[PDB]
């Protein structure tokens, strides 16, 4: 079975703005895998942002709860991360991830998409 993760939607935006990240996964992943978003700012490591599906309820980091919204679109096999009320601390490389703890010893990562929040 094919395994592929395609991210998009990043870029530059003013503080208080909105960006929408997407992650199209192959049907083998989108159906039976937990899929989460992680971000890595320059100088730090990857940290949890939001996750969905996989039988588990939707989860958010406390710093983004109420601002970010994760969702699924069955007609596109795509997970979306809506980011509203963005701030400078949100500047990072956002990674889409898919993993299953029970049987698969692997976690699948996307290539990363840049999200910059500059005041100009």
Numbering used by the authors: 0 to 119
What does the paper say about this structure?
AT118i4h32 is a nanobody antagonist for the angiotensin II type 1 receptor (AT1R), a G protein-coupled receptor (GPCR) that is a central regulator of blood pressure and renal function. AT118i4h32 directly competes with the binding of small molecule and peptide ligands to the AT1R and is active in vivo, reducing mouse blood pressure to a comparable degree as the clinically used angiotensin receptor blocker losartan. We demonstrate successful use of our software on three polyreactive nanobodies, including AT118i4h32, a nanobody antagonist of the angiotensin II type I receptor (AT1R), where we reduce polyreactivity without compromising binding affinity or target-specific pharmacology. Synthetic nanobodies provide an ideal reductionist system to probe polyreactivity in the context of a fixed framework without the influence of heavy and light chain pairing effects.
